[PDB]
Design a protein around this ligand. Structure first.
Ligand SMILES: CC(=O)SCCNC(=O)CCNC(=O)[C@H](O)C(C)(C)COP(=O)(O)OP(=O)(O)OC[C@H]1O[C@@H](n2cnc3c(N)ncnc32)[C@H](O)[C@@H]1OP(=O)(O)O
Length: 212
């Protein structure tokens, strides 16, 4: 029950975070749904990568249950010659590899520091999820406000969130973000042919940003 606390997520919390995301987050993602992604250990491992950056937050109720998370990573301004490690490289899951390959392609097509060339460090919002028993109560907004406190404490001015869902992008707009980059699924043809055709409201990847 409530009030809930908002706390820093520790690496120890990884199993509990994954359990929560399986019930409330992963199955709602449109690319996951389009591919009919089953149980996917690679997705779970990839989802936990931001935690050691020590800027991910959990909402925890009076029973000690995680009822919301906002997983965040830190993004440092790249040098022109830096090449990012391809996430899809060495992925063993063929369906999930297609998703990571698209993520790598977005990274090659758009650099957030082209929008913000004077910024040295940007906060990267990766996964925002709230328990379906506790939605409409402002938990997402308070998780986001906790990240604003991290940003103020550390001199970070820009919050970046990549969305694969039209509905996710609108949630971020309601939270005060704006779109800075779009790539339509209909235009993503890495080997000459379309790979993704999710349900109609989902037109493409939308990168959202907020100056805070
Ligand atoms: C980085 C990212 O992943 S972007 C974040 C998007 N995440 C997701 O889409 C995961 C699935 N959805 C969720 O986990 C949640 O619905 C969230 C995170 C989008 C919203 O969390 P909440 O704590 O409910 O946020 P909040 O209280 O502000 O409600 C947001 C809106 O959802 C609507 N809503 C109400 N009940 C529900 C429900 N059961 N499911 C979805 N949305 C609901 C509310 O009416 C509210 O509308 P408004 O913004 O016009 O006022």
């Amino acid at each position: 029950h409530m009030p809930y606390t908002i706390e820093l997520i520790q690496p120890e919390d990884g199993e509990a975070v994954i359990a929560m995301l399986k019930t409330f987050f992963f199955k709602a993602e449109p690319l996951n749904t389009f591919l009919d992604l089953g149980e996917c250990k690679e997705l779970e491992k990839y989802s936990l990568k931001p935690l050691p950056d020590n800027c991910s937050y959990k909402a925890v109720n009076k029973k000690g249950e995680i009822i919301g998370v906002f997983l965040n990573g830190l993004m440092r301004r790249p040098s022109p010659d830096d090449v990012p490690e391809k996430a899809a490289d060495s992925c063993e899951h063929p369906k999930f590899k297609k998703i990571l390959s698209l993520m790598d392609h977005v990274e090659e097509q758009f650099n957030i520091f082209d929008v913000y060339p004077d910024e040295e460090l940007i906060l990267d919002g990766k996964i925002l999820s709230v328990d379906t028993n506790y939605r409409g109560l402002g938990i997402a907004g308070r998780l986001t406000e906790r990240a604003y406190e991290y940003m103020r404490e550390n001199g970070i001015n820009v919050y970046h969130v990549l969305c694969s869902s039209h509905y996710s992008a609108r949630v971020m707009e309601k939270l005060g973000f704006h779109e800075v980059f779009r790539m339509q699924f209909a235009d993503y043809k890495p080997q000459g042919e379309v790979v993704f055709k999710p349900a109609a409201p989902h037109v493409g990847i939308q990168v959202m940003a907020k100056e805070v």
